[PDB]
């Protein structure tokens, strides 16, 4: 299964943020980003670990080992705002209960 | 398509059509999300055809599909108050030289309200 921390996550344009993932068993590298934009379905972001998808810019990040995975945004945008989830399909296909990432403005 | 409102205990088949790809190369599968946002996994099968559920639908929901009209089915029987969600279905990969287990969207959903 996986725990996702932490649920809320204000951030600055410009600055970097980090959602983490667990899960209860060795799951090696299979491990999934979804960014749900608000009003929108979730898309994907990162695939086995660390790889970018084709479309994805690079501000996007993943790595992790053994149980904790985490991904890292390394200038937040203002289109980077909305819920991720990782999803961990190394054992048996589970998502995290989600980070909303929200904006901090004047 | 195929949701709608529901009264508990109710019957219900979503349907999900594919286009561009074929069913006959790619897996589909199907995933929830309650109004709280919470996300869950609803029922998937294999690369060999084989399917699972989680114990929150088995024996309940029944995952299904036409290779050749490419269509992804659900049906959801005794349906609950906690079925109610938005359903999406989304492609199976792998890439990786295991398991295809990422469900890549391309559903815009279809709201099942029990109730």
């Known amino acids: 299964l996986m725990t996702q921390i932490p649920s809320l996550l204000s951030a600055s344009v410009g600055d970097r943020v980090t959602l983490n993932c667990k899960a209860s068993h060795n799951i090696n590298k299979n491990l999934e980003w979804y960014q749900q934009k608000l009003g929108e379905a979730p898309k994907l972001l990162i695939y086995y670990a660390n790889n970018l998808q084709t479309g994805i810019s690079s501000r996007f990040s993943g790595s992790g080992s053994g149980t904790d995975y985490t991904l890292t945004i390394s200038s937040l945008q203002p289109e980077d705002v909305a819920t991720y989830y990782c999803?961990?399909?190394?054992?048996?296909?589970?998502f995290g209960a989600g980070t909303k990432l929200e904006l901090k403005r004047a | 398509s195929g949701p709608g409102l529901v009264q508990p205990s109710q019957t219900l088949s979503l349907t999900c059509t594919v286009s561009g790809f074929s069913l006959t190369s790619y897996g589909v599968s199907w995933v929830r999300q309650p109004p709280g946002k919470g996300l869950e996994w609803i029922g998937t099968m294999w690369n060999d055809g084989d399917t699972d559920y989680h114990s929150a639908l088995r024996s309940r929901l029944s995952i299904s599909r036409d290779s050749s009209k490419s269509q992804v089915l659900l049906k959801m029987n005794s349906l609950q108050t906690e079925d109610t969600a938005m359903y999406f279905c989304?492609?199976?990969?792998?890439?990786?030289?295991?398991?295809?287990?990422?469900?890549?969207?391309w559903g815009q959903g279809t709201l099942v309200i029990v109730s």
């Open positions: 989304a492609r199976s990969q792998l890439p990786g030289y295991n398991l295809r287990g990422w469900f890549v969207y």
């Open positions: 999803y961990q399909y190394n054992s048996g296909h589970t």
